[PDB]
Structures are given as C-alpha cells and as structure tokens.
C-alpha cells in the first residue's frame, strides 16, 4: 500500500529528537561542562568571574548563584543546574557552588556504571540509599555552639569562615563582627525568626572600604527643606506625618462656587488661617523636628523656618516605617490627631556632607533600644560596593542559619572525607548489585577536597590519601586540607566551622536533582 | 474537465490503503509513549516554540504537548483525555491497548474481510471482558473503620509506584489519604490547595489541617503589628477600606468655606465609622478581597491587630470553610456567628517567602499541601503525581472493589476469551482469538521496560493461569512471577473497565472509516 | 572546546590565558593613552 511520507506532527520536517543512551550521554556532557566552569571558584584560594551584561555593564563576582544567574544558556540541563543553585541560595544562602560541583561529579561518575549495563533507576536508588547513610552519619559528628549575646565568639568565627573566600577578606574581622552585631540586634529569639526588612544595607562610592560601619539608627538620602535651617539637633523629638502641608481637599468630585466679593475675601482669609492653624498644631505638642511623606508649600516652609523647627520633605514609605520603629514613635495621618505621646525620641539627627559633590545625607543616631539597623558601605569602585553587599548578605544568612539551628561541623573537606568513609564501610556489606552505586557515591563525594587541593597548588591524590589514612588511623573527623599553609591539618584549632543544615541541604538537594536528571531518556525540540 | 466538481486542491483517499495508513499512524502515536509504563518507566522532555520546557511521565500530558494533526491519530489523544477526565489513572494502558487491537487485525484487513465482522467481534469481546471483570473483583461489605483506610493506602501506594516520588511513596500516600477524609460528601477538588515553594528537600513537604497562603502587598506600618495570636477571631470581608470617593456618579456643590470643612471631615468620619465597627466586634485578624489603605493599616497597627488585603478569592473561600464564618459585604452587623475561630495564627518564613498559617481547627473541611523542591518542573511533576493518587482515592471511597495489578487481570481475561473462542465457529473464532492475544501487551511492556526476557515470563504466566493462580503477575524486583494480591498491588476495577470500553470504542470507530477528504486551507 | 553547546548564539567565553591577555592589554592601553599629560611639561 506504499506507506509514502504521511504527516503526523505539525512541522515534522524541522523538529528533532534524541532517544536512548545517546540522549542520556549528552545530558552528562552538558552537566560536566557547567561544573568544570565553577570548580576553579572554590575555597579561600579561588578566583573570580567577570560578566559583561547584555547592555554592556560589568560585574566581577565570586558567588555561584550570581554567576549562573547572569549566564545565558540554551541547554536545558544547564538551566536545571542554574535553578538548583538558585534554590540553594534561596533557603540557606551559602554553599551555592559546592552543590553544582557535587552534582556534576555524581553525573560524571554514573557514566561508567551506565557503560557496564546498569539500569539508571538502579543507580538512582543506590544514590538515594547512600545519601540517607551519609545524612544519618553527618549529625553524629556534629557539636553545638551556643547562641547568646554575651559571648559572640563562635558566631564571629563562623562569619570569618564564611567571609574568608571573598575579596572583603582584607578587612573580614571587622565585617564579620558587623554582621553578627546586626543579626543579634534585629533577631527575634522567642519565635527564632529574623526579618531582613529591618536591616537596611546601602553603600556610597568613595572613601575607603575600612570606613564601612554599623548604624543603630537610620540614614536617608534627604536633607532639610530650607537652606538656612540648622544642620544638627541634639534632643530630637520627631513628629512623623503622612499628610501634606496643604489646605485640605476632598477626594470625591467637588466645586466651590464664588458668587460675590465677600465670598472671595472669606476664602482668602480661610487659606492663611489654615496655614497658621497647622503650624500652631505642630508646635503646641512639644515637637522639635518634623518629617513628612509629601511636599510642602513656600508659606509652610517659611513658617516652619520662622518658628525654629526643622523639617524633611518627600521621604518614602519604607523610610517612614523604619524611622517609626527606630525612634519609637507612631505614624499619624492628620495634624488634629497629633499628641505628645506619639512623638519619637532621637539622641542625634545630623546632615552629613560627602566630598566635592553637592549631595547630602541625613543620619538619625543615639536612639534607645532599636529594632532597625543600617550598614553603611564605602569603597573606591562600584564593583567593590556590589561585591561587599553580596558578601555581607552571605554572612547575615549564615548567622541566621545558626540562629535557627545551633550545631556545626568542621570544613576543609573533613566532613566529606568522613562521610565517604562511612558510605564505603556501609557499602562493603551490600551484596545486591547496589554496592557499585554506593561506591560511586563515595567516590564522587571526594571531589571537594581534590578541588581544594588543586586550587591551593598542592597535589590532590597524595594529600587526600594522606588525610584519609590519618583519619582512619586516629579517631578524629576534624582533619582536612591545609589550604592556607599553617602547618596543621586539624580544623578544630584552625577554627574552620560550617553549619550542619548547609551540608545536609547540599547533599540531599544534589542527590534529588541527579535522580531527576537520570530519569530522562527522550527529548524533542524544534530546529533553528 | 471544463468545469470540475469540487474546488481545486481537495485531496481524497479511499480503499484498503487509507485504512492501512491509519493503522500505521496509530502505531507511531502509541510508540510515542510506549516506554513510560511500569515501576521501571522513564519520562520525556518536551520543548515548545517559545523555549519553555516540560518534563513528564503522565501519558495524557505527553500526548497533549505533541502537535498531532493526523485525523486517525487524534482519536488516541481523545480517548486518553477522556480516561484522564473520568478516572484519572491509566492514560497509557488504554493507548497501547487500542494500538494493539488495530495491529492484531491489520492482516485480516489486508485479506479483504468486511470490517463490520471485526466490529461485531470487538463488541462481543468487550462485553464478555467487562462482565468477567465485574464478576471476579474482590470486595468486602462491612470491612472496618481501619481496614477501610489500609485499602486506600495500598491503592495510593500502587498509584505512586511509577512516578518521580516513588521512593517516598509511603510518606506521601498517608498524607493524601488524610486529605480525602476531610472533604465532605461532594469531595470538591477546589477544597484542596497545592502550594509550591522553591528550595528544600522532598521530605520537608507538609500538610496543614487548616489554611495557609502567601503574603500580599502591604503598605507602611505592616511591620509594627503583632505576628502571632492564640485564640483570635477572624473577620472575613468584601469591603474596600480606604479613603476614596463614595461613588463615581457623585458630585458636590457648595457655597461656604464652613461647609467645605464639614465636607472634608465627612470622609474621615465615614472611614473611622467603618473601622470602629470592625474593631468593636472583638476580631483580631481581618481579611478582604479588596484593597486596604495605609490609614487603615496604621489604625489597625495602633490597636494590636493584623490586616491583609487583595487576598485571592479561592483562599478566602478556603478560609471560610476551614474556620467557619461568612464573607461580609457590609460592616453594619458583625455578629458573633459571622466570625471565624482558629487555634493558632502565625506568619512564618518558608524558603525566601512569607506565609500566613491558620492552624488548629478540628471542624475543618479543608487541608492544604506545601511542596518543597529544587526546580520549577520538579514541583510541577510532584503535583501531577499527587493528582493521580487524589483521584484514585476519591474513586475508591464510593465503589470499593479491588483487582490485582502487574498484569494478572489482563492474563485472566486473555485466558477466558481464548477458552470462549474455541466454542464458536467461523471467522468470529479467529477475531476473538486476536482480541485475546492483544491483551498481553501490558505484561510484555512491563518486562521490556524492566529489562527481562519477556518470552520466558509470559510462558510461565500462561502455564500458571491455565492450571490451578488467578492473581499471578510479574515481580519486578525478584525478576520472576509472583502473587500480586498478597504482595499488595491493588487497583480499582473502574480503571480497567473504562480502559477496555474506551480502547474498544476507538478501535471500532477507526476501523469503520472508508475514505478521507481534505478541503483546501 | 566541548562538542555540546551550552550558550546561545552570540554569547562568548574567554578562559585563563585569553582572559588575562585581554585584561592586561586593555589596562596598559588605557595607561599609555594618558601617560603623555603628566607633570609640568605635559601636553593636551
Ligand atoms: N581556612 C580554610 N581552610 C580550608 N578550607 C576552607 C577554609 N575556608 C573555607 N574553606 C572551604 O571553602 C569551601 C567554601 O567555598 P566558597 O568559595 O566559600 O563557596 P561556597 O561557600 O558557596 O561553597 C568550604 O567547603 C570550606 O570547607
Ligand atoms: N509493584 C508493582 N509491580 C508490578 N507492576 C506494577 C507495580 N505497580 C504498578 N504496576 C503496574 O504499572 C502499570 C501502570 O504504569 P503507569 O505508568 O501507572 O500506567 P498507567 O498510568 O496507564 O496506569 C500497571 O499496569 C500496574 O499493573
Ligand atoms: Mg561560601
Ligand atoms: Mg498509572
């Protein structure tokens, strides 16, 4: 019956297809490539990447999440790796580049097993069982720290470990202490939750990186509304308003009919009476400085100046609520509702002026116990400011994680080596063809020490074998890679500390993503 | 020839060749989803014109995303959609069944046999098979209050055995069963909310016997009001609370400045009247589908209350059902019988987002899922997998009969039909024989996907069934045959009954077409 | 270069040797552009 070419799928002549191991193999290749891009950016001796945007802008960065975010990729496996990194960033905040390396190593190691005649579902099941064994072993070697305001030393050490890999390491003791102080000032301890809307991070170019400081108050990009107002107050009583300094206006449609001369004169008197009334209402309550969300008028401005009462104009809503929380005041929508109990108190309010430019800034400091805190970043480049912001965010996220759960492990590859030993020891008792998958998991779990050694300039295989032999001989899981060449392999005295939830998340998330990748055998995509 | 009958460009085909071509196309359609069946089934990735990708193991989804344009092939997509609509599980078995029915009778069509004999044979065979399935299915009249949950758990576990969440099926099955023990007597699917939050492990998913929903856009002052309550009263509203014009048709004409000031004060008095009416009822949490202004936000903050605006309608109805109030479009009568009551309200950080939780309601006809994953397609596939189990549990609650899976019922029906065929003479015998032989494509595909030798297993199964072993199917892990009713591989009989009826209907419809005509454009 | 394409059409990547070469060439060119205007006897 001559089965001549007949049409089944629309645009059948242009679409492509891949079936079987070849498709599978292609996926692996893509994954490996992505991992081999990130491998060099791991550890305290890692280097950085420079991304040029689609419009020409330049970004120098070290974060895995940002790196994978700014890349424009076409392969679907690359996009899956990007999303894995983004999810790890979303929950934990640190460890965004270890997870992609681990996933790439896992996929690479699965290749030889696929070549020997193993169903990929079996490989996925073996990986899952090995991951469960590793996670069960991980919390057995973990120690608690203690989270309390009095001591703050373990937290500083943890932040130091997190910041040691960034360009901010020239002053990372200072920044670590800043981060721990900010988190301890903002955090809620009964509910064990922190809120990042109460931490304001902002930077201004110029000066030096060491000029970065912590302000237990507010700082806004505004100034006083009249050029002849005083530039500082020292006993500030803040009145926070949401209504503009204008005569009232109804919202619904309205018309005011003027039908005579007496009506004209009455309206003329009413205007200035309203202005004087609002100024007197502000002054009577005892206030000393006024803050408004909207604009003023010339008459209102001169009346504020003449009555020795400075004011600020056109400040935003989030700034209003931050000032209200910091100074302990309340937000009022009318002058009639202003009372003496609704004023905030601030020890100092100042207008700071930077260098030869015309800009100004307003700082509110010496408040009482405050739930709002600001980080003020300086530096000589814009890229420096951006990277400092990212590093500070990493440190804050790590301290938050320590607040949630207070037990830690030791880094430098000690935890991975111990987990690999446990996985191999367990795999030696499994005879049901699953020992190969477990040994593949154990072998791929050892790419982090090798990457660290290769980046540090040592020889990977010999160093890893020596540390493994020492860990088996002695009975401490705290031996890692001496990256900074301080002589000792012990990470407990070198004070290299990591959170437990970070490690658990890395392992589980990488394993599940690998399992999802292994399941795919077909792919259809249009041509170009 | 001077003037032609039809418009130029009309394409016509008729005879045996077009029927053979249709049968050929159905084979390609069935091959598209052939290797996604069983505990050892893979899944497919499809990319569309815009670039978005989708990864799925569900047959109906894959058939939907394929841009099939062959008129004979569209029937297999239609029957898959119908099976998905009716029972919710079994949308790949029906496709393979229909294709096998066509392929086994292709050679008879080649010999010049009238298709109506084939149609009659198919109808008789389908009737006999459905009657046998209804006869041999296992049921318990007064089972238990505990043996009625275990059956649903086994059904869900079997329904999840070939999906991405197989390894955690024992963890998920339990949950879904609970989900359907709270859904009243109508079992509305809109009463179960599915929420997907990026970041986290698959074992961190949770079920809340209550309600939870995302944070909405908020104005200044939202951060100065409490975020935990112990015995709150909830006011559910459909009223816009902000300073605005009373009506779009309104217009104000005034002659004196005193009346101007009075008009200015009137709007504030109205808004404050609404706010005091809300406050004096004793409520601590207020929710509204319509916006809440900043003045209202600060007013509520100053009196230690919580507010939310622009809440989605489905979430508000779900909250009504969970807590037990009523949506109010007016504030002139907020009685104690129109307010909700929960046991804990909280706002919590979940992986980069803020979620509001109402928990602790024992009178709730609603549950909510929170799914934790690592990428968008991951949670989408998790939800698609859970939907099958939900539908299976709903169907199993009403009619409770169970048959064994793995291919036991296919081989039992095949043996029964073969034993019946030897009785009758003529071409009916050959056609019933072909129908009987077409039913063993399910165990063969299971074995082929697993990676076994299908011939040996099929021979052993046939010998076991002919002797005596009613519930004997394939053991994938032990690579052998085994009793699938003692290994707890259970499924409702509705799945098989509907699959057989739909596949037979599709085959009969495709066989009875004589010619095809295509008009231009 | 790996046979599989990870990037779109028009995207570009330079690795260690080429990256350092490009960066150093650009920096030195910028420096030598403005070297000539330094000191009491520079030109415009
Ligand atoms: N002083 C140190 N000595 C040895 N290893 C270190 C040291 N500081 C950090 N590391 C290692 O660096 C790794 C972290 O890499 P990093 O570049 O910070 O990105 P990420 O934290 O996202 O993985 C950790 O595995 C940790 O063990
Ligand atoms: N534990 C098990 N052992 C053997 N077969 C199983 C098991 N669980 C499910 N199956 C089989 O898997 C088949 C269905 O796979 P699936 O992709 O769900 O197809 P469908 O969606 O059409 O039901 C069923 O025929 C069932 O008998
Ligand atoms: Mg880090
Ligand atoms: Mg199914």
Short mmCIF file of C-alpha atoms in Angstrom, two decimals, chain B residues 5-411:
data_model
loop_
_atom_site.label_atom_id
_atom_site.label_comp_id
_atom_site.label_asym_id
_atom_site.label_seq_id
_atom_site.Cartn_x
_atom_site.Cartn_y
_atom_site.Cartn_z
CA UNK B 5 -16.89 19.11 -9.41
CA UNK B 6 -15.03 20.18 -6.26
CA UNK B 7 -12.70 23.08 -5.57
CA UNK B 8 -9.10 22.75 -6.71
CA UNK B 9 -6.84 21.37 -4.00
CA UNK B 10 -9.23 18.83 -2.47
CA UNK B 11 -7.33 15.67 -1.50
CA UNK B 12 -9.17 12.35 -1.38
CA UNK B 13 -8.05 8.84 -0.43
CA UNK B 14 -10.13 5.67 -0.28
CA UNK B 15 -9.93 1.90 -0.07
CA UNK B 16 -7.78 -0.54 1.86
CA UNK B 17 -4.60 1.61 1.55
CA UNK B 18 -6.03 4.51 3.56
CA UNK B 19 -7.20 2.18 6.34
CA UNK B 20 -3.76 0.56 6.43
CA UNK B 21 -2.17 4.01 6.61
CA UNK B 22 -4.42 4.94 9.54
CA UNK B 23 -3.43 1.75 11.37
CA UNK B 24 0.21 2.61 10.68
CA UNK B 25 -0.14 6.11 12.15
CA UNK B 26 -1.75 4.79 15.34
CA UNK B 27 1.39 2.69 15.86
CA UNK B 28 3.59 5.80 15.84
CA UNK B 29 1.27 7.51 18.32
CA UNK B 30 1.43 4.51 20.66
CA UNK B 31 5.21 4.30 20.27
CA UNK B 32 5.50 7.92 21.41
CA UNK B 33 4.51 6.92 24.98
CA UNK B 34 5.43 3.22 24.94
CA UNK B 35 8.38 3.18 27.38
CA UNK B 36 6.77 5.15 30.24
CA UNK B 37 4.88 2.24 31.71
CA UNK B 38 5.65 0.46 34.93
CA UNK B 39 7.93 0.69 38.00
CA UNK B 40 10.89 0.93 35.60
CA UNK B 41 9.50 3.66 33.33
CA UNK B 42 11.38 6.72 32.10
CA UNK B 43 9.97 10.16 31.30
CA UNK B 44 10.04 12.62 28.41
CA UNK B 45 11.15 16.23 27.94
CA UNK B 46 9.22 18.44 25.51
CA UNK B 47 10.18 21.95 24.38
CA UNK B 48 7.75 24.35 22.71
CA UNK B 49 8.21 27.27 20.33
CA UNK B 50 8.89 29.89 23.00
CA UNK B 51 11.61 27.82 24.68
CA UNK B 52 9.94 26.69 27.90
CA UNK B 53 10.44 23.01 28.67
CA UNK B 54 8.30 20.43 30.44
CA UNK B 55 9.30 17.04 31.85
CA UNK B 56 6.56 14.49 32.36
CA UNK B 57 5.78 10.81 32.85
CA UNK B 58 1.97 11.21 32.51
CA UNK B 59 0.71 9.88 29.16
CA UNK B 60 -2.11 12.38 28.67
CA UNK B 61 0.25 15.34 29.15
CA UNK B 62 2.77 13.99 26.63
CA UNK B 63 0.04 13.35 24.07
CA UNK B 64 -1.31 16.87 24.64
CA UNK B 65 2.07 18.52 24.06
CA UNK B 66 2.58 16.67 20.78
CA UNK B 67 1.14 18.65 17.86
CA UNK B 68 -0.64 15.72 16.24
CA UNK B 69 -2.52 16.61 13.05
CA UNK B 70 -3.34 13.16 11.63
CA UNK B 71 -7.15 12.67 11.71
CA UNK B 72 -6.90 8.97 12.56
CA UNK B 73 -4.27 9.60 15.25
CA UNK B 74 -6.26 12.29 17.09
CA UNK B 75 -8.66 9.61 18.35
CA UNK B 76 -5.95 8.14 20.58
CA UNK B 77 -5.38 11.58 22.11
CA UNK B 78 -9.12 11.99 22.64
CA UNK B 79 -9.51 8.66 24.44
CA UNK B 80 -6.54 9.46 26.67
CA UNK B 81 -8.13 12.79 27.60
CA UNK B 82 -11.45 11.05 28.31
CA UNK B 83 -9.76 8.46 30.55
CA UNK B 84 -7.97 11.25 32.41
CA UNK B 85 -11.28 13.08 32.89
CA UNK B 86 -13.22 10.06 34.16
CA UNK B 87 -10.94 8.05 36.46
CA UNK B 88 -7.66 9.97 36.48
CA UNK B 89 -5.28 6.99 36.23
CA UNK B 90 -4.46 4.65 33.38
CA UNK B 91 -3.96 7.00 30.43
CA UNK B 92 -1.15 4.96 28.83
CA UNK B 93 -2.58 1.45 29.09
CA UNK B 94 -5.59 2.49 27.01
CA UNK B 95 -3.39 3.83 24.20
CA UNK B 96 -1.27 0.68 23.95
CA UNK B 97 -4.45 -1.41 24.12
CA UNK B 98 -6.07 0.45 21.22
CA UNK B 99 -2.92 0.26 19.10
CA UNK B 100 -2.58 -3.47 19.76
CA UNK B 101 -6.22 -4.05 18.82
CA UNK B 102 -5.62 -2.33 15.49
CA UNK B 103 -2.30 -4.09 14.85
CA UNK B 104 -3.58 -7.60 15.55
CA UNK B 105 -6.39 -7.28 12.97
CA UNK B 106 -4.38 -5.45 10.31
CA UNK B 107 -3.55 -8.72 8.44
CA UNK B 108 -7.22 -9.71 8.23
CA UNK B 109 -8.00 -6.28 6.79
CA UNK B 110 -5.27 -6.90 4.21
CA UNK B 111 -7.01 -10.11 3.07
CA UNK B 112 -10.28 -8.38 2.18
CA UNK B 113 -12.55 -9.03 5.17
CA UNK B 114 -15.62 -6.89 5.77
CA UNK B 115 -14.89 -4.53 8.69
CA UNK B 116 -18.34 -4.96 10.24
CA UNK B 117 -17.47 -8.53 11.22
CA UNK B 118 -14.42 -7.14 13.02
CA UNK B 119 -16.60 -4.55 14.77
CA UNK B 120 -19.10 -7.19 15.90
CA UNK B 121 -16.29 -9.38 17.26
CA UNK B 122 -14.78 -6.45 19.17
CA UNK B 123 -18.14 -5.54 20.72
CA UNK B 124 -18.81 -9.12 21.84
CA UNK B 125 -15.32 -9.49 23.30
CA UNK B 126 -15.55 -6.20 25.18
CA UNK B 127 -18.91 -7.12 26.71
CA UNK B 128 -17.58 -10.50 27.84
CA UNK B 129 -14.42 -8.98 29.32
CA UNK B 130 -16.28 -6.30 31.27
CA UNK B 131 -18.70 -8.88 32.68
CA UNK B 132 -15.79 -11.09 33.76
CA UNK B 133 -14.05 -8.16 35.48
CA UNK B 134 -17.23 -7.31 37.37
CA UNK B 135 -17.63 -10.97 38.35
CA UNK B 136 -14.17 -11.72 39.76
CA UNK B 137 -13.39 -8.45 41.56
CA UNK B 138 -12.82 -8.69 45.32
CA UNK B 139 -14.92 -6.63 47.73
CA UNK B 140 -15.76 -6.53 51.44
CA UNK B 141 -19.24 -5.49 52.57
CA UNK B 142 -18.65 -4.33 56.16
CA UNK B 143 -14.89 -4.16 56.11
CA UNK B 144 -13.89 -1.98 59.08
CA UNK B 145 -13.02 1.54 60.15
CA UNK B 146 -9.34 0.56 59.90
CA UNK B 147 -9.47 -1.95 57.03
CA UNK B 148 -11.14 0.83 55.03
CA UNK B 149 -8.10 3.13 55.35
CA UNK B 150 -5.49 0.45 54.62
CA UNK B 151 -7.16 -0.33 51.29
CA UNK B 152 -6.98 3.33 50.24
CA UNK B 153 -3.34 3.47 51.33
CA UNK B 154 -2.49 0.42 49.21
CA UNK B 155 -4.32 1.95 46.24
CA UNK B 156 -2.39 5.22 46.59
CA UNK B 157 0.94 3.42 47.01
CA UNK B 158 0.30 1.43 43.83
CA UNK B 159 -0.73 4.62 42.03
CA UNK B 160 2.56 6.32 43.00
CA UNK B 161 4.91 3.43 42.19
CA UNK B 162 5.98 4.69 38.74
CA UNK B 163 6.37 8.42 39.47
CA UNK B 164 9.22 10.71 40.49
CA UNK B 165 8.21 10.47 44.17
CA UNK B 166 8.26 6.67 44.28
CA UNK B 167 11.00 6.36 46.93
CA UNK B 168 8.92 8.44 49.38
CA UNK B 169 5.55 6.91 48.46
CA UNK B 170 4.92 5.54 51.96
CA UNK B 171 5.39 9.09 53.25
CA UNK B 172 3.09 10.69 50.68
CA UNK B 173 0.30 8.09 50.48
CA UNK B 174 -0.62 8.56 54.15
CA UNK B 175 -0.95 12.31 53.66
CA UNK B 176 -3.19 12.12 50.61
CA UNK B 177 -5.50 9.68 52.38
CA UNK B 178 -5.94 12.16 55.22
CA UNK B 179 -6.58 14.85 52.61
CA UNK B 180 -9.63 12.99 51.32
CA UNK B 181 -11.02 12.07 54.75
CA UNK B 182 -11.89 15.74 55.39
CA UNK B 183 -13.56 16.68 52.08
CA UNK B 184 -17.26 16.38 52.99
CA UNK B 185 -19.63 14.34 50.80
CA UNK B 186 -19.18 16.14 47.46
CA UNK B 187 -15.36 15.81 47.56
CA UNK B 188 -14.72 19.05 45.72
CA UNK B 189 -11.20 19.25 44.31
CA UNK B 190 -11.11 23.01 44.92
CA UNK B 191 -11.13 22.32 48.68
CA UNK B 192 -7.52 21.05 48.50
CA UNK B 193 -4.89 23.74 47.96
CA UNK B 194 -1.49 22.94 46.48
CA UNK B 195 1.34 25.38 47.23
CA UNK B 196 4.81 25.07 45.70
CA UNK B 197 7.80 26.73 47.39
CA UNK B 198 11.29 26.53 45.89
CA UNK B 199 14.21 25.23 47.92
CA UNK B 200 14.19 22.29 50.28
CA UNK B 201 14.09 18.51 50.26
CA UNK B 202 11.19 16.32 49.19
CA UNK B 203 10.81 15.04 52.76
CA UNK B 204 10.13 18.58 54.00
CA UNK B 205 6.69 18.75 52.38
CA UNK B 206 3.83 19.16 54.82
CA UNK B 207 0.06 19.03 55.18
CA UNK B 208 -1.75 21.64 57.27
CA UNK B 209 -5.22 20.83 58.62
CA UNK B 210 -6.28 24.43 58.26
CA UNK B 211 -5.23 27.02 55.69
CA UNK B 212 -2.08 28.80 54.56
CA UNK B 213 -1.45 31.40 51.89
CA UNK B 214 1.22 33.79 50.65
CA UNK B 215 1.89 37.29 51.93
CA UNK B 216 0.19 40.08 49.98
CA UNK B 217 1.39 43.56 49.07
CA UNK B 218 1.46 45.78 52.15
CA UNK B 219 1.83 49.49 52.88
CA UNK B 220 3.81 51.26 55.60
CA UNK B 221 3.01 50.20 59.15
CA UNK B 222 2.61 46.48 58.45
CA UNK B 223 5.87 45.75 60.29
CA UNK B 224 4.64 47.37 63.53
CA UNK B 225 1.81 44.94 64.36
CA UNK B 226 1.86 41.54 66.09
CA UNK B 227 2.53 38.36 64.15
CA UNK B 228 1.26 35.63 66.49
CA UNK B 229 -2.10 35.02 68.17
CA UNK B 230 -3.51 32.21 70.31
CA UNK B 231 -7.33 32.49 70.23
CA UNK B 232 -8.12 35.08 67.55
CA UNK B 233 -11.42 35.90 65.89
CA UNK B 234 -11.30 36.34 62.12
CA UNK B 235 -13.33 38.89 60.16
CA UNK B 236 -13.77 37.93 56.50
CA UNK B 237 -14.80 40.88 54.35
CA UNK B 238 -15.57 42.01 50.82
CA UNK B 239 -15.34 45.74 51.58
CA UNK B 240 -12.74 48.24 50.34
CA UNK B 241 -11.33 50.03 53.40
CA UNK B 242 -9.57 53.19 52.27
CA UNK B 243 -10.17 56.91 51.83
CA UNK B 244 -11.87 57.26 48.45
CA UNK B 245 -14.78 58.83 46.59
CA UNK B 246 -18.14 57.47 47.75
CA UNK B 247 -19.46 56.92 44.22
CA UNK B 248 -18.24 57.61 40.69
CA UNK B 249 -21.57 59.33 39.97
CA UNK B 250 -21.10 61.70 42.92
CA UNK B 251 -20.71 65.46 42.66
CA UNK B 252 -20.51 68.12 45.36
CA UNK B 253 -21.62 71.74 45.04
CA UNK B 254 -21.01 74.03 48.00
CA UNK B 255 -21.18 77.76 48.72
CA UNK B 256 -19.39 78.40 52.05
CA UNK B 257 -15.99 77.50 53.46
CA UNK B 258 -17.59 76.18 56.66
CA UNK B 259 -19.49 73.59 54.63
CA UNK B 260 -16.23 72.94 52.77
CA UNK B 261 -14.56 71.99 56.06
CA UNK B 262 -17.58 69.89 57.05
CA UNK B 263 -17.41 68.00 53.74
CA UNK B 264 -13.70 67.40 54.28
CA UNK B 265 -14.38 65.95 57.74
CA UNK B 266 -17.23 63.75 56.47
CA UNK B 267 -14.97 61.31 54.61
CA UNK B 268 -12.72 60.74 57.61
CA UNK B 269 -15.79 60.24 59.79
CA UNK B 270 -17.13 57.59 57.39
CA UNK B 271 -13.85 55.67 57.24
CA UNK B 272 -13.44 55.79 61.01
CA UNK B 273 -17.04 54.64 61.45
CA UNK B 274 -16.25 51.51 59.44
CA UNK B 275 -13.02 50.94 61.37
CA UNK B 276 -14.68 51.26 64.79
CA UNK B 277 -17.47 48.92 63.71
CA UNK B 278 -14.81 46.35 62.78
CA UNK B 279 -12.82 46.94 65.98
CA UNK B 280 -15.69 46.65 68.47
CA UNK B 281 -16.66 43.15 67.30
CA UNK B 282 -13.61 41.66 69.02
CA UNK B 283 -11.83 40.45 65.88
CA UNK B 284 -8.04 40.27 65.82
CA UNK B 285 -7.41 39.23 62.18
CA UNK B 286 -9.17 40.84 59.21
CA UNK B 287 -9.05 39.66 55.59
CA UNK B 288 -10.50 41.25 52.47
CA UNK B 289 -10.56 40.59 48.74
CA UNK B 290 -10.47 44.37 48.20
CA UNK B 291 -7.59 46.75 48.96
CA UNK B 292 -6.77 48.02 52.45
CA UNK B 293 -5.38 51.54 52.69
CA UNK B 294 -2.38 52.77 54.62
CA UNK B 295 -4.59 54.73 57.02
CA UNK B 296 -6.44 51.51 57.88
CA UNK B 297 -3.10 49.70 58.20
CA UNK B 298 -1.79 52.22 60.73
CA UNK B 299 -5.13 52.29 62.56
CA UNK B 300 -5.00 48.52 62.99
CA UNK B 301 -1.32 48.60 63.96
CA UNK B 302 -2.01 51.12 66.73
CA UNK B 303 -4.52 48.71 68.35
CA UNK B 304 -2.52 45.46 68.01
CA UNK B 305 -4.35 43.88 65.09
CA UNK B 306 -3.44 42.16 61.81
CA UNK B 307 -4.75 43.00 58.35
CA UNK B 308 -4.40 41.69 54.81
CA UNK B 309 -5.78 42.91 51.50
CA UNK B 310 -6.26 41.60 47.97
CA UNK B 311 -6.47 38.02 49.26
CA UNK B 312 -7.29 35.62 46.39
CA UNK B 313 -10.92 34.53 46.24
CA UNK B 314 -10.13 30.81 46.39
CA UNK B 315 -8.01 31.30 49.51
CA UNK B 316 -10.76 33.33 51.18
CA UNK B 317 -13.38 30.67 50.42
CA UNK B 318 -10.96 28.06 51.74
CA UNK B 319 -10.51 30.09 54.94
CA UNK B 320 -14.29 30.35 55.30
CA UNK B 321 -14.60 26.58 55.01
CA UNK B 322 -11.73 25.92 57.43
CA UNK B 323 -12.67 28.40 60.18
CA UNK B 324 -16.42 28.72 59.71
CA UNK B 325 -17.56 32.29 59.17
CA UNK B 326 -19.12 34.12 56.24
CA UNK B 327 -17.96 36.76 53.78
CA UNK B 328 -19.47 40.13 54.72
CA UNK B 329 -20.02 42.88 52.16
CA UNK B 330 -21.19 45.26 54.91
CA UNK B 331 -19.99 46.12 58.41
CA UNK B 332 -23.32 47.24 59.88
CA UNK B 333 -23.90 43.89 61.62
CA UNK B 334 -20.80 41.91 62.61
CA UNK B 335 -22.31 39.37 64.98
CA UNK B 336 -20.54 36.56 66.82
CA UNK B 337 -21.96 33.96 64.42
CA UNK B 338 -20.30 35.52 61.34
CA UNK B 339 -16.72 35.47 62.68
CA UNK B 340 -14.19 32.69 62.31
CA UNK B 341 -12.23 30.95 65.05
CA UNK B 342 -8.82 29.29 64.85
CA UNK B 343 -6.38 27.99 67.45
CA UNK B 344 -3.07 29.40 66.16
CA UNK B 345 -2.34 32.10 63.62
CA UNK B 346 1.23 32.80 62.55
CA UNK B 347 3.37 34.34 59.83
CA UNK B 348 6.41 32.23 59.02
CA UNK B 349 9.47 32.29 56.78
CA UNK B 350 9.43 29.48 54.21
CA UNK B 351 12.43 29.45 51.86
CA UNK B 352 12.57 33.11 50.88
CA UNK B 353 8.82 33.78 51.19
CA UNK B 354 6.40 34.71 53.97
CA UNK B 355 3.35 32.52 54.57
CA UNK B 356 0.30 33.03 56.78
CA UNK B 357 -0.82 29.91 58.66
CA UNK B 358 -4.20 29.31 60.31
CA UNK B 359 -3.95 26.01 62.18
CA UNK B 360 -5.78 24.22 64.96
CA UNK B 361 -9.31 23.91 63.61
CA UNK B 362 -10.90 20.49 64.28
CA UNK B 363 -14.11 21.37 62.41
CA UNK B 364 -12.27 21.90 59.13
CA UNK B 365 -13.44 20.53 55.78
CA UNK B 366 -10.16 21.51 54.14
CA UNK B 367 -6.45 20.71 54.05
CA UNK B 368 -3.51 22.40 52.36
CA UNK B 369 -0.30 20.97 50.88
CA UNK B 370 3.12 22.64 50.95
CA UNK B 371 5.55 21.05 48.48
CA UNK B 372 9.32 21.52 48.70
CA UNK B 373 11.56 21.01 45.69
CA UNK B 374 14.57 22.30 43.82
CA UNK B 375 13.31 23.49 40.42
CA UNK B 376 10.01 24.52 38.89
CA UNK B 377 9.45 21.36 36.85
CA UNK B 378 10.29 19.30 39.95
CA UNK B 379 7.34 20.62 41.96
CA UNK B 380 5.11 20.58 38.88
CA UNK B 381 5.81 16.87 38.38
CA UNK B 382 5.29 16.26 42.11
CA UNK B 383 1.85 17.88 41.92
CA UNK B 384 0.95 15.94 38.77
CA UNK B 385 1.93 12.72 40.56
CA UNK B 386 -0.18 13.58 43.62
CA UNK B 387 -3.24 14.37 41.48
CA UNK B 388 -3.46 10.75 40.29
CA UNK B 389 -3.44 9.47 43.87
CA UNK B 390 -6.09 12.01 44.90
CA UNK B 391 -8.41 10.94 42.09
CA UNK B 392 -7.81 7.24 42.77
CA UNK B 393 -8.63 7.71 46.46
CA UNK B 394 -11.85 9.57 45.62
CA UNK B 395 -13.00 6.85 43.22
CA UNK B 396 -12.06 4.10 45.69
CA UNK B 397 -14.12 5.67 48.53
CA UNK B 398 -17.51 5.21 46.75
CA UNK B 399 -17.11 1.83 44.93
CA UNK B 400 -14.53 -0.21 46.90
CA UNK B 401 -13.80 -3.29 44.66
CA UNK B 402 -10.09 -4.20 44.06
CA UNK B 403 -8.35 -6.34 41.37
CA UNK B 404 -4.57 -7.23 41.35
CA UNK B 405 -2.10 -5.30 39.23
CA UNK B 406 1.05 -6.15 37.35
CA UNK B 407 -0.85 -7.82 34.52
CA UNK B 408 -2.77 -10.51 36.40
CA UNK B 409 -6.20 -9.36 35.24
CA UNK B 410 -5.00 -8.98 31.63
CA UNK B 411 -3.85 -12.60 31.55
#
